[PDB]
Each structure stands twice: as structure tokens, then as C-alpha cells.
């Protein structure tokens, strides 16, 4: 007698349902990792015995997205190919834990200014049964969490 | 013929039952590790053969707490988001080995001034069957054990 | 009711079917890895709080090809044996994800100026049941992806 | 009797460093305006801030 409207309030959310809004378009991905919030630590000790522990400045997140290779055009390729020595169309990423149908966002992770730093092609092997999966890494500046 | 009132006096305590009082509120967690008491070592040798071994100064504990992601508000997020360059609401953590019902504290671990240094979001994967689990690390200054 | 002409448009491409055009000839290979597009990262921080994150210059790809040892002549050997102190016939490599019959190229990877840097002979073992597999590594300068 | 006394204080030498931006170089425009004695002296304030 849990009456599943109470499951939507009280039970934890699984990981296998997520949408990725990449800039102004939604792109289907398989994995999404590295959306951390990390700080440095500043310490100070004197001779009397006082230890002072403080949070430092937060460093940049390194975000890994991976999807499969499809017969159309490679949208992750034309965004990493258009680099001119420091110039890149920086995009904002949203990764939202989603309802089963896709009509509710439960908890989402916002990424402010992401740009690609790597794009690894799949390893071709004649004795394998796998999908060609590209794996892109992104450099950002902050990760925030909105909960609704 | 052990008469389980003697089990509460003579048998060791398992790990799977613990409450975490985080500041002034109790927050449910899955794991809790890193509540060590570590010292440094100062040594001195002379030519006659005397070795002098001494305890140094005790270093800071690094404490890892991890819980799941729930549909409400993220209480571990608003405590790591409210950082202003060295400023953080430092909290005192109590992790108590508890009775089954929760009406007895067996052995508890006290943590003096804890503040968050990291908050790792879960790794999203479409081929997984897991709970979204956040994992927060804390910087403290001492860990004490009271036994009652 | 997917009507497999729609599979050629909408489903991902597996890895086990690939042709390798090595210069002006096609050579059968077993594996092909390392066809990445990697960038460096340039960062700049000032005292006011501005972080500037930029893509650096893209570094060289290191490409691994491996095939078996055949009773004829070793075509990967006469291309690594003909080195004179900096001189090498640099070749352009194309690795194409292919149809089952071989009459359609789905997505191909182009490699601009590849030359061999290593050629590892197989490990001979009397208690093994394996093919003599050579493994050549190549140094290139760029990797591009054309999708047709 | 040893008599130890502070002397006269000497001049500070302050070094600053910033990055090169595509616009106008404000630090070149202040070191190029030297005419044998004549430089716009400025007040430097370096404040640790929130």
C-alpha cells in the first residue's frame, strides 16, 4: 500500500532515464559522467595550535558524454572541427533526470559554458559485437543543480 | 543459552545500522567512511645508538558521506553552493551505531567542524540499473569517539 | 514493422565491418584504434574572478593497426624497413565503416600523412593456439571524418 | 655600547603581470609616454576583496 503517487515524492530516482539538451537541441546520449562540484582547500597553522581550514576556489568540471555513430551527419564532429586557435561556439548543457514518458523533469544538472576538448573514435575490431560509440569530453566552468 | 540481553553486552556491533546527525538535522545516508585518527611520526637518531620515536601532530580527517538523489530539494547542494571565497557554515557531524528500532545509541563518532569540499553527481548510464547516488566529501579537524 | 531500409537510416553502425585503404591499396586488418581528435587547453585567471578557458592546439594522433602474418610478402615490413634517417613514404589512411557486401561506405575516417613508428612481431609460444599477428603503430597529423 | 638604528627607507619595486588582449594595450600607452623626465605617476591600490 504505497500508492505510486507517493513513489514520485519519496523514492530515489534511477540513472537510466536522462535527456541532454546540448545548446538549443536535444541530442540522445548513452552515458554522461563527470558533473562534479570540486573545491580546493587552503590551510594555515601557527605555533599556538590553531589550524584554519577554508574552502579554496572551485576548479573546472570535466564532463564526458558518449553516444553512438549514426548514418546521418555527425553533429559532435562539426562542433569540434570548427576550432580556430581559441575560438569555439561554447554551449550550455542540461542533463535532466526524466519521467518514463519524458513529460516531467525530476532533477536536472546545468552546465554553463561547455566546449569540446576531445572526440575519441571507436576502436574497430573484427571479432567484436558492439556499436561504434564516440566519446566526447567537454571543458566547462560551473555545474549547478536545479530541483523541480 | 545466550539470553540476548547478554548479546547487547558481549557481542560486536555490525555496521549496517547508523544514523547521521548533520548539524541540527538527521539526514539519511548509505555510506560513511574515513573517520580515522591519524598521527605523524617524529624520529631522532644520534651516533651512540639511541633512537627516539614520538607521535607528531594529528592531521585532518577526510570524511566521505554518500546518499541517494530524491525528488525534493537537495540539502547537500545548498550547503556546498553557499561558499564565498573562504566562508562556509561549518557543521558538526555525529555518526551513531544504533539499535534496530533506533531507540538506543551504542557507539557514536563525533566530528567537530565539517565543511564540504566536493559533491560528485552520479554517472548517468542508459544500460544500468542503479540509484542516482551523490557522494560528498568533508574536511574536518578532529574525530572523537564516545561510547554509551 | 521496421522495414530494414529504415534500419540503414536510423540504427547505429557496428564496428566489425571496416575496410582500410592504405595509400593506394586496400590491406585487410583485424583491429584499428586510436583515431582520436584531441586538443590542449589554455587557461587564464586574474584577480577579479574571470576564468578564461580556450582550446589549445590539437596534437598528433597515434594510430594502431594490426593484421595477421601471411605466407606471401610482408607489405607492412617493406614500408618500415625503407627509412633513411628522416625519410619515409608517408601514406594517407582511410578506414571506412562498410556495408556487409562491401558496396556502400557508411562513415569513413580519413588520416592525412601516416608513417610507421613501430612494428611488433608476434610472441611465439608452443602452448598457444593463436595467429601470428603483427601490430603496427602510425604517426599522423590530422584525423577527419566524412559521413556519406 | 653598540647603537643600532633604522636608516632611511628605500624605494619599493612593484611588479605586475597581466595577459595580452586583442584590444588596446593600456600598459604600452603608459610606458611609451616617457619624455626624459615626464611620466604620469599613478596611485596603485591592490586590495584583497570578497
Amino acid at each position: 500500500a504505497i500508492t505510486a503517487d507517493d513513489i514520485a515524492v519519496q523514492y530515489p530516482i534511477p540513472t537510466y532515464r536522462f535527456i541532454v539538451t546540448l545548446g538549443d537541441e536535444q541530442v540522445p546520449f548513452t552515458s554522461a559522467s563527470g558533473l562534479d562540484i570540486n573545491f580546493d582547500t587552503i590551510e594555515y597553522r601557527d605555533g599556538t595550535g590553531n589550524w584554519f581550514k577554508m574552502p579554496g576556489q572551485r576548479q573546472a568540471p570535466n564532463i564526458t558524454l558518449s553516444k553512438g555513430v549514426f548514418p546521418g551527419k555527425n553533429a559532435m564532429y562539426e562542433w569540434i572541427n570548427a576550432i580556430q586557435l581559441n575560438q569555439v561556439e561554447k554551449k550550455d548543457i542540461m542533463i535532466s533526470l526524466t519521467n518514463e514518458a519524458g513529460t516531467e523533469v525530476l532533477v536536472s544538472w546545468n552546465v554553463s559554458n561547455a566546449f569540446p576538448t576531445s572526440l575519441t573514435s571507436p576502436s574497430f575490431d573484427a571479432t567484436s559485437n558492439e556499436i561504434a560509440v564516440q566519446q566526447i569530453t567537454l571543458m566547462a566552468d560551473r555545474v549547478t543543480i536545479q530541483t523541480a
Side-chain angles (χ1 to χ4, degrees), chain A:
Chain A
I2 302 299
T3 182
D5 287 331
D6 292 331
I7 293 173
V9 179
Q10 299 176 357
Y11 284 8
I13 304 167
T15 60
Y16 62 90
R17 188 67 69 210
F18 62 96
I19 58 171
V20 177
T21 301
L22 190 142
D24 290 329
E25 295 179 354
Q26 292 184 358
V27 178
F29 287 98
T30 304
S31 297
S33 65
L35 282 82
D36 302 337
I37 299 170
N38 292 318
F39 284 92
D40 290 329
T41 302
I42 300 169
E43 293 179 354
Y44 178 75
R45 284 176 285 180
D46 55 354
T48 61
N50 293 319
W51 205 304
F52 293 101
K53 304 181 184 67
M54 291 174 283
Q57 54 184 355
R58 55 184 291 167
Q59 63 265 20
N62 294 114
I63 298 166
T64 294
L65 296 175
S66 68
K67 67 177 290 185
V69 175
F70 287 89
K73 65 183 291 293
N74 204 166
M76 296 300 106
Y77 176 71
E78 291 104 13
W79 181 44
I80 202 168
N81 207 170
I83 307 297
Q84 297 297 319
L85 182 144
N86 55 359
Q87 294 180 357
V88 56
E89 294 291 327
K90 291 185 179 181
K91 291 179 171 66
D92 46 352
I93 313 299
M94 188 189 296
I95 298 171
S96 302
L97 286 176
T98 317
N99 198 359
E100 177 67 31
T103 63
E104 292 290 326
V105 170
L106 301 173
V107 173
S108 67
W109 282 260
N110 297 116
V111 174
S112 179
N113 287 319
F115 65 96
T117 61
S118 70
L119 180 64
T120 65
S121 68
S123 179
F124 305 103
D125 195 1
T127 64
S128 68
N129 285 316
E130 287 180 354
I131 286 300
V133 172
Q134 289 174 353
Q135 179 261 333
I136 185 165
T137 62
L138 301 172
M139 180 69 75
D141 48 354
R142 70 182 183 272
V143 171
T144 60
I145 301 169
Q146 66 176 359
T147 61

